[PDB]
Write a protein that binds this DNA or RNA. Structure first.
Ligand SMILES: [Mg+2]
Ligand SMILES: [Mg+2]
Ligand SMILES: [Mg+2]
Ligand SMILES: [Mg+2]
Ligand SMILES: [Mg+2]
Ligand SMILES: [Mg+2]
Ligand SMILES: [Mg+2]
Ligand SMILES: [Zn+2]
Lengths: 174, 45, 222, 162, 176, 97
RNA sequence: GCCUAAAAGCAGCCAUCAAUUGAGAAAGCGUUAAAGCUCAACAAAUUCACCAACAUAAUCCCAAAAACUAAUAACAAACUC
């Protein structure tokens, strides 16, 4: 064949690229699910139940999403965008309500996604949802750090406490 | 640059090396340094 | 997925008043009292006048020769006026009213005795002539689809063409006649009087170049 | 090649896909610059209804044609190869490419008439009863008109109608 | 059976067509449906239409979902004109304000469609403006002291002359 | 999905599709899953149970269809076309149903 | 939105806006009117896909026949040697 007549980028594909870039740069939770062909009423009901938690959904064509993803650092998501796709976009990720609202529908499975640049599967999302909060784990960090000295002091103070316990046992026996 | 290798829990055995090197940095310090770090953490957070 | 292509927008095309076709008379206001001869030169050969677009954009091009009378005029008028859009489309005639008289005789009359009586009037049309020329803010596919019926019902073979289609077919004709492979061409042979073929040919063949034979026009003959 | 295997085990159907080994293309093509398979193997205007080894490369085991999007041939040569396969099937070549019916192979019928270079179908042509005169002759077509551009070592055109 | 869309008045739900034969073919009773509709819309001003969706199950049972009244009715009421204009864009039917448009949006947002769709009041206001321009009613920014009556007298004269011309044209067509 | 919509899928109990989204032969599997989870299949019968099992290290997609004729159709579709799986399932449920 | 008994995208006339990533006050089927079946728009893929085909008379159809061995062949007059 003759040499390639190279194609030009159009305004629509430029807008799509800019939108995908803004999505992947701004928000934190980017979940990838299989867009199930459901009725429009149920789709709007799910829209409302997601807007209650303030997590939105987007849909991008594969012809514009595959090249962007294979060019960016998210090339590990290529086998996820083969069929129908749905990008759940959320700021300040809270996967608990998302898993709860997807449990109510049996044939709508969570494929995967990234939570703060951490690509996880469905089991990874389940583990992240069951995991405690950031404030709670930060409060537990210092506790687990000082637990060594706490157990040290406990062992140092339990020696006089053993006599007290034996004395209380002898009192209770009589 | 690139992102992580997309791990899962079915065969989870590789942990971030930053955690291990931070644990080593903690364990390679004396008790007074650990007390200073704990005091600074309790004051800030 | 599919890229959105822009739609052709028309704003400089001004739709004139009375966009539909006008009424034509079967016999003109001044009927010819003197009977004329049926010259065939008005059909033989290519058309000399009304071969280009004036104000319209589509047209009914006749690839042959023949006669058009009040019946065909009424057919075309009714069909176009009922299948056109007077708000976005306008039409115009490219052929005048029927003026050439035709003589007829009643059955049972032997040959001779004089000329017949003027029965009706017709309009001579040559090959390569436009019949109806239309314009407006419409596309080419719909006007072609709705004018192919009239092109079929016309006596001579006709096609619903436009400026672009006519230019394209003329460029194709020029390309074919200039890249033809055989060194022997009808025009060259007739002009050089090769093989004494002028005994069989006609003096009008020197101009027709073997493309026009009687009333038929074959565009695939270089 | 992919094969669908079905197993019946107590009202339970097991349908599985099995991939076998398929032979690849020969290593040295005579004209590697051609995009089409035949046009690059320089078999254009070379094959015919007699060449069975070439036609048998792309046909289903039940005599079916292989799709163009999977084969890769140019449109003209694909149509020519389809015509050649039809003509070979009608002529009686490719004996191992018919469906096996043990119930229908028993009731033998009238012997198959020996034919070759047939254009139409054996059950869709009506015999010519008028046959025409010399000037208006109803010619009997033989062979496909798509193969009129074959190389003629004898130089004479191929009689497509006789 | 499935879903059926209907637009009936508040309390004027009669068991005749064009509502009778539908539920008759479906299977459910007509008198029972009319009684349910009247007892559910008894507090509504009788005379206004409101859309309803009837979900009929295979066991000849039916459930009703009523929405907010017709936006065409809302606009006709806010304009004070009973029947909208004929030649939309060529003639003026009524005159409403952005205040009335926002009020209609606020009172109609509480419906099934705008409840399923998490849209702000701006979308509903734009839809109301579109429906008003379809009806032919002009929407001025803020002009209502007497201009409403100044246009109303001219609209009344226009509709009176229009009715006279319609009667004259009907008589002419009958005589021709 | 129109085939399963017009075939009358009222005679099925449970349909489960077990797959791993991080494999390289899940195209036909997810196509079949969407074709059987379309809205028309749902409105054809509401007593059926559609389940989509998602794993990460299974590496073997499968489809299990249990229907009340005491029948269990198991299709380990890892290389089969989605259309082939659909037509085989349709023929089987039409023959036994 | 008007007329009509009904005109719910479609006897008709006028407007042809408005949200969703995305759906025309609707380009054909269908009802008396509905309902319902489609087209185009998103998400799923993306072989080629614009028009071109048409019976017939009378005694009995009328050489048989042949798609590939090389052809600016050959056979072919009251023409010319
Ligand atoms: Mg004609
Ligand atoms: Mg929008
Ligand atoms: Mg479509
Ligand atoms: Mg007949
Ligand atoms: Mg004979
Ligand atoms: Mg001789
Ligand atoms: Mg002599
Ligand atoms: Zn080729």
């Amino acid at each position: 064949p003759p040499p390639t007549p190279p194609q030009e980028e159009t305004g629509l594909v430029r807008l799509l690229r800019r939108e995908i870039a803004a999505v992947f740069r701004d928000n934190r939770m980017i979940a990838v699910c299989q867009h199930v062909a459901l009725s429009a009423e149920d789709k709007l009901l799910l829209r409302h139940q997601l807007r209650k938690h303030k997590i939105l959904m987007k849909i991008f064509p594969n012809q514009v999403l595959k090249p962007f993803l294979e060019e960016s650092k998210y090339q590990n998501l290529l086998p996820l965008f083969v069929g129908h796709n749905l990008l759940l976009v959320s700021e300040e990720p809270k996967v608990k309500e998302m898993v709860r609202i997807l449990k109510g529908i049996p044939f709508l499975p969570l494929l995967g996604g990234c939570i703060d640049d951490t690509i996880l599967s469905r089991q990874g999302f389940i583990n992240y949802s069951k995991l405690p909060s950031l404030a709670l784990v930060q409060g537990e960090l210092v506790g687990g750090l000082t637990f060594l000295t706490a157990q040290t002091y406990s062992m140092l103070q339990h020696q006089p406490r053993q006599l007290t316990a034996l004395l209380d046992q002898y009192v209770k026996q009589q | 640059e690139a992102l992580a290798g997309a791990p899962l829990d079915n065969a989870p055995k590789e942990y971030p090396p930053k955690i291990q090197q931070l644990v080593q940095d903690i364990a390679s310090l004396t008790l007074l340094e650990i007390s200073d770090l704990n005091e600074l953490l309790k004051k800030t957070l | 997925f599919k890229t959105l292509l822009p739609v052709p927008t028309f704003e400089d095309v001004a739709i004139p008043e009375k966009p539909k076709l006008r009424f034509v008379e079967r016999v003109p206001l001044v009927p010819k009292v003197r009977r004329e001869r049926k010259n065939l030169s008005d059909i033989r050969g290519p058309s000399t006048e009304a071969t280009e677009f004036t104000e319209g954009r589509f047209a009914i091009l006749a690839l042959g020769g023949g006669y058009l009378h009040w019946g065909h005029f009424e057919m075309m008028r009714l069909t176009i006026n009922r299948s056109m859009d007077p708000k976005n489309m306008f039409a115009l005639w490219r052929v005048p009213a029927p003026f050439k008289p035709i003589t007829r005789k009643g059955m049972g009359q032997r040959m001779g005795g004089g000329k017949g009586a003027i029965d009706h009037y017709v309009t001579p049309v040559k090959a390569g002539r436009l019949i109806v020329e239309m314009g407006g803010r419409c596309e080419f596919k719909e006007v072609q689809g709705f004018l192919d019926l009239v092109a079929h019902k016309l006596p001579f073979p006709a096609k619903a063409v436009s400026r672009e289609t006519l230019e394209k077919m003329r460029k194709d004709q020029e390309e074919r006649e200039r890249n033809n492979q055989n060194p022997w061409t009808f025009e060259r042979i007739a002009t050089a009087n090769m093989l004494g073929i002028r005994k069989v040919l006609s003096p009008y063949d020197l101009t027709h170049k073997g493309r026009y034979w009687g009333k038929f026009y074959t565009p695939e003959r270089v | 090649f992919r094969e669908v295997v079905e197993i019946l085990d107590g009202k339970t159907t097991i349908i599985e896909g099995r991939i076998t080994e398929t032979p690849q293309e020969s290593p040295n093509p005579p004209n590697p610059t051609g995009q089409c398979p035949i046009c690059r193997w320089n078999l254009k205007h070379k094959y015919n209804y007699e060449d069975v080894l070439l036609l048998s490369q792309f046909i289903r085991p039940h005599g079916g044609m292989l799709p163009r999007r999977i084969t890769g041939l140019c449109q003209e040569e694909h149509l020519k190869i389809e015509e050649c396969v039809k003509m070979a099937h009608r002529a009686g070549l490719l004996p191992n490419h018919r469906p096996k019916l043990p119930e229908g192979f028993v009731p033998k019928s009238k012997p198959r008439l020996n034919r070759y270079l047939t254009r139409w179908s054996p059950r869709s042509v009506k015999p010519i009863y008028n046959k025409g005169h010399r000037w208006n002759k109803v010619r009997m077509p033989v062979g496909s008109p798509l193969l009129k551009d074959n190389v003629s070592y004898s130089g004479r055109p191929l009689l497509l109608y006789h | 059976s499935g879903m059926i869309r209907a637009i009936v008045r508040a309390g004027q739900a009669r068991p005749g067509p064009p509502l009778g034969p539908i539920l008759g073919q479906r299977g459910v009773s007509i008198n029972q449906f009319c009684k349910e509709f009247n007892e559910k819309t008894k507090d509504i001003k009788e005379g206004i239409p409101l859309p309803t969706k009837i979900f009929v199950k295979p066991d000849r049972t039916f459930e009703i979902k009523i929405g907010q009244p017709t936006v065409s009715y809302f606009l006709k009421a806010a304009a004070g004109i009973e029947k909208g204009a004929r030649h939309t864009g060529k003639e003026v039917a009524g005159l409403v304000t952005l205040k009335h448009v926002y009020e209609i949006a606020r009172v109609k947002a509480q419906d099934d469609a705008f409840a399923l769709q998490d849209v702000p009041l701006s979308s509903v206001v734009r839809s109301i403006i579109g429906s008003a321009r379809s009806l032919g009613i002009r929407v001025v920014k803020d002009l209502s002291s007497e201009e409403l009556a100044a246009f109303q007298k001219e609209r009344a004269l226009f509709l009176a002359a229009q009715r006279e011309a319609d009667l004259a044209a009907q008589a002419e067509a009958a005589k021709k | 999905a129109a085939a399963l919509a017009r075939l009358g899928l009222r005679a099925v109990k449970q349909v489960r599709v077990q797959f791993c989204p991080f494999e390289k032969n899940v195209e036909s599997t997810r196509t079949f899953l969407q074709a059987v989870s379309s809205e028309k299949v749902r409105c054809t019968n509401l007593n059926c149970s559609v389940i989509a099992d998602v794993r990460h290290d299974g590496s073997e997609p499968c489809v299990d269809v249990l229907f009340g004729d005491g029948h269990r159709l198991i299709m380990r579709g890892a290389h089969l076309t989605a259309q082939e799986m659909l037509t085989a399932f349709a023929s089987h449920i039409q023959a036994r149903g």
